[PDB]
């Protein structure tokens, strides 16, 4: 009997399983080649011909147009990993793939899915306990650590050539923006601007203790540089105000034509006059500025920029100290901000306003320079992770070695744990532990090393020497990640195992796939 | 003669019956593999490409694009179960499938349909008396019982890995929200919000004795945290009011251009002033909030949120005690609510507002966290069922054992009831009793146990040890369900038989199908 | 640069392997469900609506229209197995598939395929030795064991309902036509004919110590039954002969039109007359028989058949003892054969000739009766196997237990062998040993038993009691196969392993698939 529409496709039991797992395995196999300091990049071109060159796992999975649903779910793993911890996106997708691969060996041995699923949930929970335990508690503020986290992050990415600098710029920015409260920090990444402009070299990028607005000084007669600038922030358009209630002038005598043109003229002037009287010499207006207004600002020697982005008004406020005022009328000197220098400056041709030298900015800007548009785009991404990863540490105060060290310890510990629980769940558990080895395994692989030999060396060397033993892909030998300074946030590995696990266990429970026709 | 339009399909008698019962049987066979704590899930992809991975029967049947009308009939059963009792969607459809299957054996024996129908109705009514009679009455808020109900509900779903936590949250939320009238409890599930947000793990989900609104503080200079918050709830927009009747300002002198602007200016300000005067320091406005208003509101150090959903306004009142006022002017201190803490906060990046720590909230929020969108989506569903099962018991005050125990009880007795009425109705009644065993049969079937033997052992032991005996899928052995806490609501089983029966009878009365071309 | 033609497909490395192996495994999982006493059958309908219902692995794979190259390669395994041992066609394919599954696990470890390949060959050669050792030697003609071989061969098929009768016929037939040159037996399965005729049940099937031919007695006045028949076997047609060299009669007088006519008559009469003179009373002619000749044979009371099939002439000779002569002229008494009864009978309404009661028939016929044509076709296949496995044991005094006992013995021993080889080959040898368990595994699987549990009991017991311990699917537990009388030829296992092994190694060696557009 015709129950489902002609065109609907369906797979049940093992077919549903074989398919779903394979799609996931293939996606993981697609991004794993990107993982690690010797991992390479992918060039992606969408339907419109837009080109994206990047090493980022999340970006890749996001830009690429996947079909198979199982493959789409893996994307969720990378996306969530990215929002919560920054780095580790390729790691989570890769681990998720391997977990499934190891589960199908069991699935094939006829272990009921519920058992595998239960075993994994146990291993996953136990992996978090171990991580919280073997993590290196650190000084949320320690610059030396924040720098290694940043530098380690900016590795195996196009921008690695200038990681010392970029790391430095990334740590400084987060430190400044970071808000202290209860010996515990909180970082709002919106207080860090990323302004990019091709030209020069990446080595020319910098941190501006203030804001870099891609705007211009409205009037040519205004000053292009103001030293000890008193900044005023208004978001009310400098123009002739009209009531909300409909209203219309009723001219009855010829003299009114003038009296009303002048009244509007006076209103416009009084606004500018009011501004001047606060002693402000620089004004940023979120909205428009009539020509007459601009003219008086110019005659006052007041520099002015109009139609400034809402988010840009906020950064200026936090950097300069200035307080945004809705109406010019309410502007007082106590609302002006400070900046050592504010000036129009041309970058790769285009003019831009620089508000720098702010006392203690609560918002900062990283100016990214580079040889081509594509270059500065992939630097901005590298920098985005660096910032988030630095953030993770200042907020968590916990760090771990990299090089596969965590995944290796976990694989040793979780396996021993398996023996403790026994039964068929112990099979799922030891399989979970096994799957974790793709991280160290993939690192050596991408480095063109003999996968089998390396694992043998690190595991044993790690078992002997300790928690920090991981793979130094550059030197192609086991090494102490801690001494090498190869370090990452605890959160990266925590979120990575959480998302991958939950995703795997969800996919692993699907024994019936029913897709309609598109 | 050409009576019907070309393309019209028609089936009569055995044909009409054979196809109708087949589609239903198949729809039942499709969701049965989802039944029980060992049941699996289905991934459903629609014509747009949106993915739905779940275990819930109603969701499945609802999301799938069914063609055959008899199949569409079954969708009604699962749906009604879901609204009325929450859990039990799949079993209702399964029983309905089985009932029709056993009925056809009688049709084939040439028993007139009206007799089979009569037997089923007799059997179904008798089943309700039996269910009401063996039902285990317990007291409405017995936390221990409620926790077993929620835990039993959560098992067999993706979330089961964390059922202890989720059960606890479900129960707490319902106990708090529940209202008692005349020694009777009534629960409006609208006083329980579910907020989702990927990141962390399902293990991080919590119960907020207050409200989590997905919005942010409208003004940057407003506080982001208010401790002993005095909350004001207003829905009228904080903007310049206009009459319902049309009006237009008729300007006649220049001095007016200013006088009217300042009047609107004053109106805006007066509102904010009035709010401040009540003592309020946190205000949720349902409509919009003018820049000028936000500016004054800010200067007062009052946190404010614009465009808050009406449903969220209602639960903020229920929770904080605040009273929703329409016009700012009518706001009073007695209209203000309380919250131990109200603060903006970022979750996986996106900002949010927490109104936590209310005295005796009447509405609460279960904040769900998870590794991926799909995971929190399924968790939400599980939480939904859990909550409704807990509601069933607080309102009904009756519970039954699970594991196919009730069905085995029903099967025994109903079969004995048959012997009583005798005749041909007796055949229909004894078949209804037989049909009821798919539940225990399917539990064993999805667990990989020998259906025939398990069925023999339960019915046997059940007859010796009574009501409590059902199947323990996790131990592949019969067991006292009451002892193991494997318990479920009386409503779940009652509503199941009701909908399963009426549907089966309706289909069974059909001896002519007439379908027009689409 | 365009090297290959558009439409050409190519896969390389892991892709070529993934594809090839997945293909092989799928084709193996497909025929897998027919293995063992509780293996089921498949109905194959080709493009011409022709229907085939078997349990035979070789028949299935040969009839299915396979697209994938890898799949096509498994067919050769099934086919070569059938030609050499009869049974084990499915086993060979199932093992080959598992062998590849276990090998990709090593491929994923990045174990060079050269190593996996070398290891598998060691395991295979070792397996042959082990088989030759554990092989139980018996008397090639020992009826007792011969019947056990046949009876186990037949079980698990449609004709098992009558495995006693059928085995008796098979063992009897092969024994009779079997030739013992020098203390060594050799058997030509061509001396055993299979005749099918729908009608009655499979129980009426029988062994004719002679030949059954689907022909009729050429002339009506000829005897339909001849008691102690003196059979004559003529090859040339009984017609007016003609020279090889072109020739024509040149008539010159009326008297010749008649003399040449009477001469051709005389020629026909002499032939028949001559035959008659030998004393022959039954005559099978391979070619035609002129109407005049028929008339004479009739007068002489000689029963004759014309147009007898060549292969039947040879069976008639081998059975009756008659010597086949080319020209009637050379036929003599010493050439006549003997049959205790040559008679015409109707079967399913069709006339057939029965030559039975032969002295020491060297060619024999098994007459197959059945309920339908399909039933009869499947019994014929069931018999073709019984006949061949019996043949195996008469030429090889070797026999082995079944129920997966051999594969279990091999898995245990080959695992030990691995240890003394060590290194990565050890891994490969272990996987080859592991792979061998799908036999016992799927035997239990098809019986509905628990694979994991069974495997543990069998191996445990086998280790305790010895070589004969295997799975008794009918009783659902381990048992002694030798006592139970469940034995198979040594050949079945030896060939299976070879074919499976050589094919697996061949596929593992591929790393580049290049397919032209069809």
XYZ file of N, CA and C in Angstrom, chain A residues 1-6 8 10 17 20 67-70 72-73 76-77 79-81 83-84 112-115 117-118 121 125 187-190 235 240-251 256 259-260 263-264 267 286-287 310 314 318 323-327 329-330 335 495 498-499 502-503 505-518, chain B residues 19 22-23 26-27 30 33 37-47 49 51 53 55 64-68 71 156-158 160-162 198-204 218-221 240-242 247-255 257-258 260-262 264-265 291-292 295-296 299 346-351 369-375 446-448 474:
516
model
N 0.827 -1.254 0.000
C 0.000 0.000 0.000
C 0.847 1.284 0.000
N 0.431 2.274 -0.798
C 1.141 3.557 -0.894
C 0.945 4.416 0.351
N 1.921 4.381 1.247
C 1.846 5.144 2.482
C 2.655 6.434 2.417
N 3.891 6.324 1.941
C 4.775 7.477 1.801
C 4.758 7.962 0.362
N 4.867 9.284 0.157
C 4.864 9.916 -1.169
C 5.954 9.370 -2.090
N 5.624 9.174 -3.363
C 6.614 8.679 -4.309
C 7.708 9.733 -4.362
N 9.969 9.871 -1.683
C 10.509 9.781 -0.336
C 11.499 8.628 -0.312
N 14.095 6.108 2.186
C 14.131 5.603 3.553
C 15.147 4.492 3.763
N 22.158 3.015 9.721
C 23.375 3.188 10.501
C 24.619 3.315 9.636
N 24.408 6.866 7.841
C 24.628 7.989 8.732
C 26.041 8.083 9.259
N 25.012 18.086 1.806
C 23.705 17.526 1.491
C 23.260 16.563 2.576
N 23.835 15.365 2.589
C 23.465 14.358 3.573
C 23.268 14.938 4.981
N 22.099 14.672 5.590
C 21.747 15.152 6.929
C 22.748 14.829 8.030
N 23.274 13.609 8.039
C 24.252 13.246 9.058
C 25.435 14.201 8.971
N 25.355 17.206 7.968
C 24.902 18.505 8.451
C 24.984 18.588 9.966
N 24.668 17.488 10.627
C 24.714 17.468 12.075
C 26.118 17.691 12.603
N 26.914 21.114 13.236
C 26.450 21.695 14.484
C 27.533 21.615 15.543
N 28.259 20.502 15.550
C 29.357 20.285 16.489
C 30.409 21.399 16.366
N 30.117 24.296 14.910
C 29.560 25.618 15.139
C 29.475 25.946 16.623
N 29.033 24.982 17.424
C 28.893 25.197 18.858
C 30.243 25.281 19.533
N 31.167 24.450 19.071
C 32.514 24.440 19.608
C 33.088 25.844 19.421
N 31.572 28.781 19.046
C 30.966 29.834 19.847
C 31.326 29.765 21.323
N 31.561 28.559 21.806
C 31.849 28.386 23.204
C 33.334 28.500 23.545
N 23.750 -4.100 21.334
C 22.607 -3.211 21.182
C 23.009 -1.741 21.296
N 22.456 -0.894 20.418
C 22.756 0.535 20.430
C 22.613 1.192 21.806
N 21.608 0.792 22.576
C 21.429 1.392 23.891
C 22.668 1.150 24.753
N 23.238 -0.045 24.664
C 24.429 -0.346 25.446
C 25.592 0.540 25.012
N 25.477 3.350 23.452
C 25.073 4.688 23.843
C 25.270 4.951 25.343
N 24.973 3.957 26.169
C 25.146 4.105 27.604
C 26.640 4.119 27.945
N 28.093 7.512 27.092
C 27.685 8.545 28.041
C 28.510 8.428 29.318
N 31.229 11.384 30.504
C 31.125 11.994 31.823
C 32.468 11.846 32.538
N 35.126 38.659 29.797
C 35.520 39.395 28.614
C 34.402 39.493 27.604
N 34.071 40.720 27.219
C 33.044 40.931 26.213
C 33.782 41.236 24.908
N 33.879 40.229 24.053
C 34.588 40.375 22.796
C 34.092 41.484 21.864
N 32.948 42.086 22.181
C 32.415 43.175 21.358
C 33.199 44.459 21.608
N 23.788 61.004 19.155
C 23.225 60.134 18.139
C 21.988 60.753 17.503
N 17.340 70.171 11.500
C 16.079 70.771 11.943
C 15.083 69.716 12.408
N 14.828 69.685 13.714
C 13.906 68.727 14.333
C 12.434 68.972 13.963
N 11.682 67.892 13.772
C 10.266 67.978 13.442
C 9.505 67.142 14.464
N 8.358 67.618 14.932
C 7.600 66.858 15.921
C 7.149 65.496 15.401
N 6.733 64.633 16.328
C 6.247 63.296 16.015
C 4.815 63.444 15.549
N 4.114 64.373 16.193
C 2.723 64.698 15.889
C 2.743 65.451 14.560
N 1.891 65.067 13.611
C 1.873 65.754 12.321
C 1.706 67.240 12.589
N 2.401 68.064 11.812
C 2.353 69.511 11.969
C 2.706 70.175 10.650
N 2.112 71.331 10.380
C 2.384 72.036 9.131
C 2.250 73.534 9.304
N 3.239 74.280 8.818
C 3.210 75.733 8.936
C 2.120 76.335 8.057
N 1.399 77.306 8.606
C 0.336 77.962 7.866
C 0.666 79.407 7.531
N 1.431 79.600 6.457
C 1.835 80.930 6.035
C 0.646 81.786 5.671
N 6.341 85.928 7.062
C 6.548 84.645 7.706
C 7.501 83.760 6.939
N 10.673 84.792 8.539
C 10.699 84.493 9.955
C 10.825 82.995 10.252
N 10.249 82.138 9.408
C 10.346 80.690 9.636
C 11.639 80.071 9.101
N 13.991 80.984 11.745
C 13.804 80.234 12.968
C 14.495 78.885 12.853
N 14.363 78.230 11.707
C 14.999 76.934 11.543
C 16.501 77.122 11.549
N 17.685 77.447 15.092
C 17.666 76.156 15.771
C 18.932 75.363 15.442
N 25.908 59.863 15.329
C 25.392 58.623 14.787
C 24.575 58.854 13.525
N 23.943 60.013 13.424
C 23.137 60.303 12.254
C 23.640 61.470 11.412
N 26.116 52.531 14.911
C 25.643 52.395 16.287
C 26.682 51.701 17.169
N 29.328 53.093 20.486
C 29.550 52.400 21.745
C 31.022 52.167 22.060
N 33.263 53.622 25.295
C 34.108 52.818 26.170
C 35.589 53.127 26.095
N 30.281 59.930 27.127
C 28.967 59.339 27.360
C 28.072 59.751 26.198
N 27.451 58.779 25.535
C 26.570 59.090 24.416
C 25.372 59.870 24.935
N 25.028 60.939 24.231
C 23.900 61.770 24.615
C 22.892 61.766 23.478
N 21.636 61.475 23.781
C 20.620 61.460 22.745
C 20.409 62.845 22.124
N 20.092 63.854 22.934
C 19.886 65.207 22.406
C 21.048 66.166 22.684
N 20.995 69.105 23.243
C 20.535 69.904 24.370
C 21.027 69.399 25.733
N 21.110 68.077 25.889
C 21.546 67.463 27.144
C 23.054 67.271 27.226
N 30.224 64.927 29.793
C 29.897 63.885 28.827
C 30.968 63.729 27.754
N 34.533 21.381 25.890
C 33.452 21.569 24.936
C 33.579 20.599 23.768
N 32.262 17.304 24.854
C 30.824 17.375 25.090
C 30.045 17.329 23.785
N 30.326 18.259 22.878
C 29.616 18.289 21.604
C 29.765 17.017 20.781
N 27.787 13.956 22.597
C 26.346 14.089 22.475
C 25.888 13.902 21.035
N 26.660 14.426 20.090
C 26.301 14.300 18.687
C 26.407 12.841 18.258
N 26.308 10.084 20.174
C 25.264 9.304 20.808
C 23.893 9.550 20.178
N 23.667 10.756 19.669
C 22.390 11.035 19.040
C 22.305 10.290 17.712
N 23.331 10.439 16.881
C 23.369 9.781 15.580
C 23.299 8.271 15.746
N 24.023 7.774 16.739
C 24.089 6.350 17.022
C 22.732 5.729 17.377
N 21.779 6.545 17.823
C 20.444 6.048 18.188
C 19.453 5.989 17.025
N 19.811 6.598 15.902
C 18.946 6.638 14.729
C 18.946 5.315 13.996
N 17.799 4.644 13.959
C 17.695 3.360 13.267
C 16.647 3.428 12.165
N 16.325 4.648 11.754
C 15.326 4.855 10.726
C 15.467 6.277 10.206
N 15.783 6.405 8.926
C 15.932 7.707 8.298
C 14.872 7.824 7.210
N 14.036 8.854 7.297
C 12.997 9.049 6.293
C 13.083 10.451 5.721
N 13.580 10.543 4.492
C 13.735 11.818 3.813
C 12.752 11.954 2.658
N 12.116 13.119 2.561
C 11.177 13.370 1.483
C 11.978 13.751 0.238
N 11.275 14.177 -0.805
C 11.916 14.597 -2.045
C 11.988 16.122 -1.955
N 13.101 16.713 -2.383
C 13.275 18.171 -2.308
C 12.542 18.972 -3.394
N -6.980 -2.708 2.699
C -6.061 -1.590 2.557
C -6.034 -0.678 3.780
N -4.158 -2.267 6.497
C -2.749 -2.431 6.180
C -1.964 -1.158 6.424
N -2.483 -0.038 5.939
C -1.796 1.226 6.121
C -1.584 1.515 7.612
N 0.970 -0.803 9.157
C 2.301 -0.386 8.781
C 2.727 0.871 9.525
N 1.821 1.834 9.664
C 2.195 3.048 10.375
C 2.566 2.663 11.816
N 5.955 0.982 12.064
C 6.996 1.980 11.889
C 7.417 2.674 13.180
N 9.236 0.352 16.755
C 10.676 0.197 17.010
C 11.246 1.330 17.848
N 12.400 1.629 26.779
C 13.718 2.146 27.152
C 14.844 1.572 26.315
N 14.495 0.721 25.361
C 15.493 0.100 24.495
C 15.160 0.471 23.057
N 14.124 1.288 22.892
C 13.715 1.715 21.568
C 14.670 2.739 20.983
N 14.699 2.817 19.651
C 15.570 3.741 18.932
C 14.832 4.950 18.354
N 15.553 5.830 17.664
C 14.939 7.033 17.104
C 14.899 7.114 15.579
N 14.293 8.187 15.078
C 14.190 8.395 13.646
C 14.660 9.792 13.261
N 15.338 9.891 12.130
C 15.797 11.179 11.641
C 14.873 11.480 10.473
N 14.158 12.590 10.558
C 13.226 12.945 9.508
C 13.636 14.218 8.790
N 13.841 14.111 7.480
C 14.221 15.259 6.670
C 13.047 15.640 5.768
N 12.540 16.866 5.910
C 11.416 17.297 5.080
C 11.836 17.781 3.703
N 10.856 18.261 2.949
C 11.074 18.748 1.593
C 11.975 19.975 1.517
N 14.601 20.344 3.721
C 15.930 19.943 4.147
C 16.172 20.119 5.634
N 16.110 18.993 9.399
C 16.248 17.704 10.056
C 15.611 17.578 11.436
N 15.507 14.796 14.470
C 15.916 13.535 15.068
C 15.177 13.449 16.391
N 12.508 10.604 19.158
C 12.005 9.292 19.540
C 10.491 9.370 19.761
N 6.289 13.411 9.353
C 6.277 12.594 8.139
C 5.131 12.990 7.211
N 5.385 12.984 5.914
C 4.359 13.350 4.946
C 3.552 12.121 4.494
N 2.593 11.702 5.315
C 1.764 10.532 5.014
C 0.814 10.718 3.844
N 0.628 9.657 3.065
C -0.260 9.718 1.913
C -1.588 9.029 2.160
N -1.553 7.720 2.394
C -2.777 6.965 2.632
C -3.626 7.582 3.753
N -3.625 6.029 7.146
C -2.400 6.367 7.858
C -2.611 7.713 8.540
N 14.811 5.923 27.687
C 14.558 5.475 26.333
C 14.656 6.584 25.314
N 15.024 7.770 25.779
C 15.170 8.927 24.907
C 16.637 9.339 24.935
N 17.020 10.240 24.036
C 18.397 10.729 23.947
C 18.924 11.207 25.311
N 18.150 10.324 28.326
C 18.255 9.347 29.406
C 19.591 9.368 30.141
N 20.652 9.718 29.423
C 21.999 9.777 29.994
C 22.059 10.700 31.215
N 21.131 11.652 31.279
C 21.065 12.613 32.380
C 19.671 12.649 33.028
N 22.615 26.221 22.716
C 23.724 25.292 22.543
C 25.005 25.771 23.228
N 25.812 24.810 23.659
C 27.048 25.108 24.350
C 27.008 24.265 25.603
N 28.165 23.989 26.195
C 28.212 23.168 27.399
C 27.618 21.806 27.049
N 27.089 21.117 28.051
C 26.490 19.819 27.820
C 25.114 19.783 28.450
N 24.289 18.825 28.033
C 22.946 18.686 28.586
C 23.033 18.698 30.109
N 24.163 18.214 30.612
C 24.431 18.138 32.040
C 24.404 19.509 32.723
N 24.567 20.577 31.938
C 24.584 21.943 32.454
C 23.222 22.610 32.558
N 18.487 47.619 26.502
C 18.454 48.550 25.374
C 19.518 49.619 25.311
N 19.940 50.114 26.462
C 20.938 51.157 26.472
C 22.263 50.675 27.048
N 23.370 51.046 26.388
C 24.723 50.663 26.798
C 25.172 51.186 28.159
N 24.704 52.376 28.525
C 25.083 52.982 29.795
C 24.236 52.508 30.985
N 6.281 59.225 22.312
C 5.347 60.344 22.300
C 3.980 59.874 21.862
N 3.044 59.863 22.805
C 1.670 59.429 22.558
C 0.903 60.305 21.568
N 0.010 59.679 20.808
C -0.814 60.380 19.830
C -2.259 59.960 20.034
N -5.172 64.067 14.213
C -4.835 65.406 14.645
C -3.608 65.890 13.906
N -3.500 67.207 13.783
C -2.374 67.827 13.103
C -2.099 69.170 13.750
N -0.834 69.433 14.028
C -0.472 70.699 14.626
C -0.502 71.751 13.516
N -1.145 72.878 13.802
C -1.244 73.960 12.842
C -0.344 75.114 13.267
N 0.906 75.080 12.811
C 1.879 76.103 13.154
C 1.554 77.439 12.515
N 1.601 78.489 13.328
C 1.283 79.838 12.887
C 2.354 80.884 13.226
N 3.219 80.563 14.179
C 4.305 81.460 14.558
C 5.537 80.596 14.780
N 6.736 81.138 14.502
C 8.015 80.431 14.650
C 8.292 79.914 16.046
N 7.871 80.687 17.038
C 8.074 80.310 18.422
C 7.445 78.944 18.674
N 7.441 76.292 16.553
C 8.335 75.211 16.142
C 9.085 74.636 17.345
N 9.438 75.501 18.291
C 10.176 75.075 19.473
C 9.281 74.636 20.613
N 6.439 73.209 20.664
C 5.867 71.873 20.521
C 6.918 70.784 20.657
N 8.120 71.047 20.151
C 9.194 70.071 20.269
C 9.482 69.832 21.750
N 9.563 70.917 22.512
C 9.845 70.839 23.937
C 8.704 70.217 24.720
N 6.844 67.668 23.549
C 6.981 66.233 23.355
C 8.161 65.799 24.216
N 9.161 66.667 24.259
C 10.374 66.449 25.030
C 9.957 66.195 26.477
N 14.780 56.813 22.087
C 16.151 57.128 22.470
C 16.188 58.081 23.645
N 15.404 59.152 23.572
C 15.379 60.131 24.651
C 15.007 59.462 25.962
N 17.737 57.365 27.356
C 18.744 58.281 27.869
C 18.401 58.724 29.283
N 17.154 59.104 29.526
C 16.801 59.514 30.876
C 16.784 58.292 31.791
N 20.283 57.640 32.797
C 20.733 58.581 33.823
C 20.173 58.252 35.203
N 25.906 36.647 28.567
C 26.127 36.016 27.279
C 26.142 34.498 27.401
N 25.448 33.835 26.485
C 25.403 32.383 26.458
C 25.833 31.968 25.073
N 26.970 31.285 24.996
C 27.503 30.850 23.712
C 27.628 32.076 22.799
N 27.925 33.229 23.398
C 28.069 34.446 22.619
C 26.905 35.423 22.695
N 25.700 34.986 22.326
C 24.522 35.857 22.360
C 24.092 36.284 23.771
N 23.798 37.575 23.937
C 23.366 38.137 25.222
C 22.013 37.589 25.648
N 20.805 23.336 28.049
C 22.101 23.489 27.405
C 22.400 22.162 26.725
N 23.252 22.184 25.704
C 23.586 20.954 24.996
C 24.680 21.119 23.960
N 25.270 20.010 23.543
C 26.339 20.078 22.569
C 25.967 20.578 21.184
N 24.703 20.437 20.785
C 24.272 20.881 19.458
C 22.811 21.302 19.425
N 22.402 21.973 18.347
C 21.015 22.408 18.215
C 20.080 21.213 18.329
N 20.353 20.168 17.556
C 19.515 18.973 17.576
C 19.398 18.310 18.948
N 20.468 18.347 19.733
C 20.434 17.727 21.041
C 19.508 18.467 21.978
N 12.092 -4.862 21.008
C 13.088 -3.813 20.805
C 14.344 -4.036 21.653
N 14.231 -4.876 22.677
C 15.359 -5.170 23.557
C 16.116 -6.379 23.038
N 15.612 -6.970 21.966
C 16.272 -8.129 21.396
C 15.986 -9.432 22.114
N 15.764 -4.015 30.724
C 17.184 -3.922 31.024
C 17.777 -5.180 31.658
